[PDB]
Design an enzyme around this catalytic site. Structure first.
Site: not given
Ligand SMILES: CCCCCCCCCCCCCCCCCC(=O)OC[C@H](COP(=O)(O)OCCN)OC(=O)CCCCCCCCCCCCCCCCC
Ligand SMILES: CCCCCCCCCCCCCCCCCC(=O)OC[C@H](COP(=O)(O)OCCN)OC(=O)CCCCCCCCCCCCCCCCC
Ligand SMILES: CCCCCCCCCCCC(=O)OC[C@H](COP(=O)(O)OCC[N+](C)(C)C)OC(=O)CCCCCCCCCCC
Ligand SMILES: CCCCCCCCCCCC(=O)OC[C@H](COP(=O)(O)OCC[N+](C)(C)C)OC(=O)CCCCCCCCCCC
Lengths: 163, 85, 124, 82, 83, 52, 246, 243, 106, 44
Positions: B41-43
């Site tokens: 997952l991204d930021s």
């Protein structure tokens, strides 16, 4: 048996006795007590409204003197006019149904002795507000229903927004 | 009434993350899985799942407590800390 | 410091810290305080005119600037009374005569005397 | 149309201030009928239909009088200019 | 909820979840006091009640109006709308 | 609670509740059809009392 | 007096239906934005609150018709000229009386659900102590106007002993002077705008969810009590406390 | 207690006994100066009550506002005003030392600090004290059946006789006397119990005894003010100068 | 004001939590909301590749002001929480023994 | 396009589909039309 007096006296019993005897009777009893006593008040005023359609002849009751001074007397006088019985049947019906309603809606809340007490004094000073027969008894009920509204809106003294 | 347990929070968050599209796999999910590294997952996708987790438990999170729940076990312990369900 | 009366109190104070007045409601609620209800830590200096910046203070709305909200309130006020006052001119007339009364307008019935027929009297 | 009741008969039957006109002769049985029953709306309908029809006749002569008022205003408005 | 409470405090309206063990036994006393008080105050205020209309005969009221007219004639007092 | 993020079951209301919905529901639409029918010339506005 | 009579039964059923659906949600939330659909889950509180809302909009055959529409009639029927204007104002309120009621019937019973799934598992019917007053006051808020209309709205009634001046009394005037349009008009439009707000809430839902900057300022005015509380608080309460501190 | 129950009413007595018999023809020329000072001490002291940090000081300024109501019934040149000033003076002498007990006896003996900011949520540890604090609050304002309202009402009525416009702004005292008193009462009565106050004893038997007496004696005058008209009906007619 | 870092990350995550929550109470429908939230996400996806600090801070406080224009009157709060209506109904009293102040009577 | 597309499906499925959402809107309408037809035919 006096119809004009039991409209007054029965929500006074339903208020004085939850406070003076709440610790002694308990919530489970004072629920059903305050409920049934407002129920029979409400039934008595339906029967009186049924009588009053027969003859438009109101009944008043007279009490002692509040104040005698020179050009002015004030008596405690209580008279059920047709306007008075109109308001009275409505407020006793809504009151008794809210008593029965708040039996089950408040069964998890702690302090419902004080709650059913204050509901009944709200009904009682409403009664005296409607059935008074000068502008003074109107004032007495008029102030004390605002006093009850203090004591009712602020039922959770812990909550800041309620206070 | 209705009182949650720990395994209730477990199978709510696992089914929640199984609904989500931008996970890596539906099979690598554990209690100790990092949302950032293990799930891919991204930021900003970890923020969307913190939004969905706080809507799902019916509870509100300040910004100082949202970033701290990096792994799933920290989220389960943190959601179990509050009295509201 | 921020308010005008707080600046009016400034030359009176002597050996008192003169801190920035901030509302105790517009503090965020999620930081842990000593009293959660007061939103205040145990030894925190109390402001010049504290009880306007208390939790028991006014509600102190934050969504509108107060001068703007003054304008919006008086705007809705003025537009209602102006619309009603102008709409008094675009009115239709009615189709009936206002109704009359026997016994010369019931003047004996509503008190009245033959010399006082005009003050207690009806249409006839 | 019913005859106008006497002033003493208005005082006897205690008809209110706003009800006393050339139609109130049909009011005093109605109310009395209304007192026999307990003001129940299914009952005592023939007499209130009578009183309502009498009042419709009063309304029609009211509207004809207002119609008569509207012509003379137009006539005086034309006659004042010429 | 049923959070714990301190039992040292005594309030007249009961406390938090006031439910004494003899509440049927005390309910008997409270129904006795309530019914007796209601019946006693209802019978006590019986002669103080009266009907609104028809208490005194109409001839008295017409005579009172006549005496009002006599007292008003002696002082030469005009009516309100006479000017 | 047996399902999450998936189709809910049809609810279980008790028999005494769902009959009282139908009684309060039937007496509403029946009483409204009575009072429309018995007061139809007055309610809608018919046979005006202005003379022709 | 007649409206004061029927209005009590109405609003008491409204508040108690509202308390029954706040009590039934495990969250016990109050935001209508987070209630969602509850029609199949709570049929009894639904049928109560819809009897109350149909009486509330003066839908005919219920006592709100008899209490409420005749006041709107009496605004036009009065003798003075200026009263015509308040007709429309009272009329406007009646249409307004529909729309929010439709909102508090739509977004809590008909809409797609907004709450999490577990309160939809735990949604159940309330006790017998909550059910029976709602039943009794539903029956009263249906039948009370047809029963007591002869008492308070007769052609000539001697029940209430108040004494209108003979020219301020316009009740014979108001029943007959109404054209067919002005009487038929609040009935039909209070129907139509109610069905309108419903059918526009399901199928489109963009007309109400526009994001114009100007409609959001306007909506936030009408949200915060027509900014009244602010105009009470900063300019009377707070200024009063400052001048008392002076 | 002896100060605010008895010394202020002693000067209320001295304006009757010493001035109204032999300064009558003076007294008429000067009733507007008394009404200036009376209205201006009702408005401006009851408004200074709102900004107070201390707790006995509030009941002190309350006593100022009630005596300011009291003396414009004395100089009212009316039967109503004189009787209302007497019933206000006697009923305030009942209700006010009970309030100085509540701030001074039950609340300074236990915590020894009178700053208002420490005291919050007194209900949950002392229910019957909070019961007292509210029913003595409402008895102070002019909430009826208490004798304070009989004094306030007949005093405002007598002050409305002599000059109506001074009675119009004199009547807002019913509002201004409620604002600070209920603003104090809800701060003491409600909230989470204060982190500063450790829990102490409930109100003892002697304090409840004093309170019960000082509250019954307001309620008897409130339900029937005629119980002491047998003393005053001479002295209500005595001080009147209406030629 | 600064490129890829943990503090800039904390700021942008906080602003995204805001913009989601802020859009949450404007919109009543689920469908229009989740469309709108996907759009909002696409606005954040089109950005977040900006190299300089100048245009970064420019778009940063510009979307902060754009975030300030769409503020709502009452945020949806859960009721047991400090914006809510169930907040502090019965806060349980802390267990305290009685302190005594008088040698003679309680 | 929708990252939470498999969560937010149960809101539109079996219980809150459009044909089901309008089911108990008029519960006693079908009974009352029959009872009113019987009262219409029985008054004559
Ligand atoms: C035909 C003519 C029609 C005229 C219509 C126009 C009338 C407008 C006048 C409105 C006056 C309203 C009455 C003012 C006193 C009301 C006091 C009050 O209500 O205070 C409320 C305040 C708490 O409210 P708040 O904290 O904001 O919100 C709580 C909800 N969580 O409680 C507190 O904070 C307590 C401390 C503040 C108490 C107020 C202190 C100052 C009092 C100033 C009174 C001014 C009276 C004269 C007003 C003149 C108006 C022209
Ligand atoms: C005619 C004149 C009427 C005179 C009224 C006489 C009533 C005398 C009895 C009042 C007793 C009321 C009472 O005891 O309430 C106690 C209440 C206890 O609080 P509780 O809910 O039990 O929770 C405790 C948390 N530890 O304490 C409280 O929380 C404060 C609320 C007190 C409620 C008072 C009810 C009566 C108020 C009447 C106002 C009269 C004004 C004059
Ligand atoms: C609280 C719920 C209400 C309870 C009401 C119960 C009514 C009982 C019957 C009333 C009989 C009555 O009062 O009679 C009145 C008697 C005698 O006056 P009378 O001239 O003979 O009759 C009057 C009827 N007139 C006018 C037609 C002739 O004077 C009194 O008693 C006054 C005694 C006051 C004592 C001081 C008050 C003490 C209160 C202390 C509270 C803590
Ligand atoms: C007249 C001015 C009214 C505009 C105010 C407004 O802003 O109107 C919007 C309201 C609110 O709609 P909502 O259901 O709360 O959606 C909430 C979604 N918001 C927050 C984006 C709005 O819509 C109405 O019902 C009013 C339209 C019907 C009026 C009668 C025709």
């Amino acid at each position: 048996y006096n119809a004009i007096s039991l409209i007054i006296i029965l929500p006074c019993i339903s208020w004085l006795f939850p406070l003076f005897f709440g610790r002694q009777l308990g919530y489970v009893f004072v629920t059903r007590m305050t409920s049934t006593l407002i129920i029979i008040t409400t039934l008595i005023t339906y029967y009186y409204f049924y009588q009053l359609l027969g003859n438009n002849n109101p009944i008043n009751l007279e009490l002692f003197n509040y104040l005698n001074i020179d050009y002015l007397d004030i008596n405690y006088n209580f008279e059920i006019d047709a306007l008075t019985i109109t308001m009275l049947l409505a407020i006793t019906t809504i009151s008794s149904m809210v008593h029965i309603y708040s039996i089950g809606y408040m069964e998890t809340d702690p302090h419902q002795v004080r709650f059913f007490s204050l509901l009944s004094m709200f009904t009682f000073w409403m009664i005296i507000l409607v059935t008074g027969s000068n502008y003074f008894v109107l004032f007495v009920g008029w102030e004390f229903i605002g006093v009850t509204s203090y004591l009712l809106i602020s039922f959770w003294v812990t909550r800041l927004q309620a206070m | 009434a209705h009182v949650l347990t720990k395994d209730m929070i477990q199978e709510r968050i696992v089914a929640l993350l199984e609904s989500f599209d931008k996970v890596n796999d539906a099979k690598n999910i554990t209690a100790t899985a990092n949302l950032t590294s293990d799930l891919g997952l991204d930021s900003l996708d970890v923020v969307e799942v913190v939004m969905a987790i706080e809507e799902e438990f019916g509870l509100e999170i300040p910004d100082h407590d949202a970033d701290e729940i990096k792994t799933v076990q920290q989220a389960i312990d943190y959601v179990s800390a509050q009295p509201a369900a | 410091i921020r308010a005008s009366f707080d600046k009016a109190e400034e030359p009176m104070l002597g050996d008192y810290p003169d801190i920035d007045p901030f509302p105790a409601q517009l503090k965020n609620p999620y930081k842990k305080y000593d009293d959660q209800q007061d939103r205040r830590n145990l030894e925190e200096p109390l402001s010049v005119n504290d009880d306007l910046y208390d939790m028991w203070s006014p509600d102190r709305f934050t969504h509108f600037k107060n001068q703007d909200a003054l304008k919006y309130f008086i705007g809705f006020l003025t537009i209602f009374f102006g619309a009603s006052y102008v709409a008094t001119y675009f009115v239709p007339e009615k189709a009936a005569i206002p109704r009359e009364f026997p016994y010369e307008g019931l003047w004996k019935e509503s008190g009245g005397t033959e010399k006082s027929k005009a003050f207690f009297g009806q249409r006839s | 149309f019913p005859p106008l009741l006497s002033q003493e008969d208005m005082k006897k039957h205690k008809i209110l201030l706003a009800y006393r006109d050339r139609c109130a002769a049909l009011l005093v049985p109605l109310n009395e009928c209304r007192k026999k029953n307990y003001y129940m709306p299914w009952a005592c309908g023939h007499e209130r239909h009578e009183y309502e029809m009498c009042e419709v006749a009063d309304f029609q002569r009211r509207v004809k009088a207002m119609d008569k008022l509207k012509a003379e205003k137009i006539e005086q408005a034309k006659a004042a200019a010429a | 909820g049923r959070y714990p409470f301190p039992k040292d405090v005594i309030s007249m309206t009961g406390g938090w979840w006031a439910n004494p063990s003899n509440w049927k036994l005390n309910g008997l006393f409270a129904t006795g006091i309530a019914v007796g008080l209601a019946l006693w105050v209802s019978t006590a205020t019986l002669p103080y009640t009266r009907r609104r209309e028809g208490i005194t005969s109409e001839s008295d009221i017409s005579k009172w109006n006549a005496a009002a007219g006599v007292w008003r004639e002696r002082h030469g007092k005009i009516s309100t709308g006479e000017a | 609670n047996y399902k999450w993020n998936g189709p809910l079951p049809r609810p279980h209301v008790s028999a005494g509740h769902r009959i009282a919905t139908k009684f309060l529901g039937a007496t509403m639409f029946f009483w409204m059809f009575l009072r429309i029918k018995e007061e139809y010339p007055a309610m809608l506005g018919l046979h005006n009392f202005y003379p022709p | 007096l007649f409206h004061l009579l029927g209005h009590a039964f109405f609003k008491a059923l409204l508040f108690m239906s509202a308390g029954s659906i706040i009590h039934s949600i495990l969250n016990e939330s109050q935001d209508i934005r987070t209630y969602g659909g509850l029609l199949s889950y709570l049929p009894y509180t639904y049928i109560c609150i819809t009897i109350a809302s149909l009486s509330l909009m003066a839908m005919p055959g219920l006592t709100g018709y008899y209490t409420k529409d005749i006041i709107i009639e009496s605004t036009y029927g009065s003798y003075s000229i200026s009263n015509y204007v308040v007709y429309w104002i009272a009329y406007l309120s009646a249409v307004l009386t529909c729309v929010y009621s439709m909102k508090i019937l739509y977004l809590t019973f008909y809409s797609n659900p907004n709450n999490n799934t577990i309160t939809y598992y735990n949604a159940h019917e309330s006790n017998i102590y909550i059910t029976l007053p709602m039943f009794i006051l539903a029956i009263f808020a249906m039948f009370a106007g047809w029963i007591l209309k002869d008492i308070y709205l007769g052609v000539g009634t001697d029940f209430v002993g108040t004494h209108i001046l003979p020219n301020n009394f316009s009740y014979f005037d108001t029943e007959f002077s109404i054209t067919q349009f002005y009487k038929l008009l609040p009935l039909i439009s209070a129907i139509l705008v109610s069905i309108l707000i419903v059918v526009l809430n399901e199928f489109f839902a963009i007309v109400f969810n526009l994001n114009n900057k100007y409609i959001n300022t306007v909506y936030s005015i009408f949200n915060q009590k027509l900014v009244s509380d602010q105009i009470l608080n900063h300019f009377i309460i707070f200024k009063g406390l400052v001048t008392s501190g002076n | 207690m002896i100060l605010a129950g008895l010394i202020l009413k002693l000067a209320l007595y001295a304006i009757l006994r010493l001035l109204l018999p032999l300064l009558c023809e003076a007294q008429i020329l000067y009733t507007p100066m008394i009404y200036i000072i009376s209205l201006l001490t009702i408005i401006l002291t009851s408004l200074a009550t709102l900004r107070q940090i201390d707790l006995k000081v509030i009941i002190a300024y309350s006593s100022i506002s009630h005596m300011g109501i009291a003396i414009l019934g004395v100089c009212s040149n009316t039967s109503l005003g004189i009787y209302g000033s007497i019933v206000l003076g006697v009923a305030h002498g009942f209700v006010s030392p009970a309030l100085f007990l509540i701030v001074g006896g039950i609340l300074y003996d236990r915590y020894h600090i009178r700053i208002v900011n420490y005291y919050k949520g007194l209900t949950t540890y002392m229910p019957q004290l909070a019961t007292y604090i509210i029913i003595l609050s409402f008895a102070n304002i002019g909430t009826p059946l208490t004798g304070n309202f009989t004094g306030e009402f007949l005093s405002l009525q007598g002050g409305f006789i002599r000059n109506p416009i001074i009675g119009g702004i004199s009547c807002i005292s019913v509002l201004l006397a409620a604002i600070y008193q209920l603003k104090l009462t809800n701060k003491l009565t409600g909230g989470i119990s204060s982190i500063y106050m450790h829990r102490t004893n409930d109100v003892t038997i002697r304090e409840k005894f004093i309170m019960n007496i000082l509250i019954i004696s307001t309620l008897i005058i409130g339900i029937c003010p005629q119980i002491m008209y047998n003393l005053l009906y001479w002295t209500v007619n005595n001080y009147i100068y209406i030629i | 004001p600064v490129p890829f870092s943990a503090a800039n990350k904390k700021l942008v995550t906080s602003m995204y939590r805001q913009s989601l929550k802020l859009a949450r109470n404007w919109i009543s429908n689920r469908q229009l909301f989740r469309q709108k939230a996907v759009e909002i996400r696409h606005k954040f996806d089109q950005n977040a590749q900006i190299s300089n600090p100048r245009l970064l801070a420019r778009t940063l406080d510009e979307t902060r002001a754009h975030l300030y224009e769409f503020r709502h009157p009452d945020p949806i709060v859960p009721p047991s929480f400090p914006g809510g209506t169930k907040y502090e109904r019965n806060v349980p009293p802390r267990m305290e023994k009685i302190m005594q102040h008088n040698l003679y009577e309680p | 396009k929708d990252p939470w597309a498999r969560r937010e499906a149960w809101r539109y499925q079996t219980n809150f589909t459009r044909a089901n959402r309008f089911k108990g809107a008029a519960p006693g309408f079908g009974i009352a039309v029959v009872a009113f037809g019987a009262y219409l035919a029985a008054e004559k």
